């Protein structure tokens, strides 16, 4: 609505975590989650 927000509110990814053998965090940044109208302006391709 107003106060567009578009920021993380709920965390349903996983209920809990007990043992962690690895961790990594990137630098702070800000990504625009605001919706857009029209065609798809971004393309992301990943190989794992």
């Amino acid at each position, epitope marked *: 609505k*107003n*106060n567009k927000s578009w920021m993380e509110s*709920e965390f349903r990814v996983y209920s809990s975590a007990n043992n962690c053998t690895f961790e990594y965090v990137s630098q702070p940044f800000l990504m625009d989650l605001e919706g857009k109208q029209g065609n798809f302006k971004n393309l992301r391709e990943f190989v794992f």
Partner: antibody, heavy 119, light 113 residues
Framework: EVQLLQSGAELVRPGALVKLSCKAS????????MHWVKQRPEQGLEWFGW????????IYDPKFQGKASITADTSSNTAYLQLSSLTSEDTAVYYC????????????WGQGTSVTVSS | DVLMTQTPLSLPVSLGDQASISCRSS???????????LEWYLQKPGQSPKLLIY???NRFSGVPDRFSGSGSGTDFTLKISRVEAEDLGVYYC?????????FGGGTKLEIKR
């Protein structure tokens, strides 16, 4: 009518802690947010924080940061607020709110618990 | 850290009259979808606050039809078409949004005589 059940009153000495219960009635707590409030006659209502039973995320007002932690019991659909490191200024009536009917617009409030910090 | 002030502090209204409680907010919470994140409450003497109106323009279920909220921008008011004895209490404004929630000072209602 959805209602939240809380303890009538609590008697706590300075420096000790209390645990305020908030039992769900007529709804499943897991599907709705839970909120807590502090009230004293001189200032009125003061917002404490909110908890998400299904996500576990909690937000606390700076006025109460470091004094309390919010949790809940999924099995009994009961929300708990722990009030520790209490002093005379913490004497207040505490309420819990939740059951927004699958919308972030509504909530239902219990009768409230009168917490007095005295010897 | 939202700041709001409720005017008037108190107001007596005789049975059958209309009550008006206004609140001013330091942040705009008016939305283009027709809803406004400000919940109205009534705290009857000796009872906990009870929700009256949710999102300003939508009446809460189980509340008498006399209760209805309206306003825009940062100024909003609660209108009671006809007031009764059971309406006695303190009316509070409750801003919503995705930021730490805030409470108002409250407005007291009395039955005029």
């Amino acid at each position: 009518e959805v209602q939240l059940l809380q303890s009538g009153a609590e008697l706590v000495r300075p420096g000790a802690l209390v645990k305020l219960s908030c039992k769900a009635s007529g709804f499943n707590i897991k599907d709705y947010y839970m909120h807590w409030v502090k009230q004293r006659p001189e200032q009125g209502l003061e917002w404490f924080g909110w908890i998400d039973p299904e996500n576990g995320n909690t937000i606390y007002d700076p006025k109460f940061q470091g004094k309390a932690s919010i949790t809940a019991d999924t099995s009994s659909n009961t929300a708990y607020l722990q009030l520790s490191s209490l002093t005379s200024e913490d004497t207040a009536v505490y309420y819990c709110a939740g059951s927004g009917n699958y919308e972030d617009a509504m909530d239902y409030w219990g009768q409230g618990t009168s917490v007095t910090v005295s010897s | 850290d939202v700041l709001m002030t409720q005017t008037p502090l108190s107001l007596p209204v005789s049975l059958g009259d209309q009550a008006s409680i206004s609140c001013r907010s330091s942040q705009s919470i008016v939305h283009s979808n027709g809803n406004t994140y400000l919940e109205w409450y009534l705290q009857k003497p000796g009872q906990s606050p009870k929700l009256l109106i949710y999102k300003v323009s939508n009446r809460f279920s189980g509340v008498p039809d006399r209760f209805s909220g309206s306003g825009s921008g940062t100024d909003f008011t609660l209108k009671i078409s006809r007031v009764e004895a059971e309406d006695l209490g303190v009316y509070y404004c409750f801003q919503g949004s995705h930021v730490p929630r805030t409470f108002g000072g409250g407005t007291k209602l009395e039955i005029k005589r």
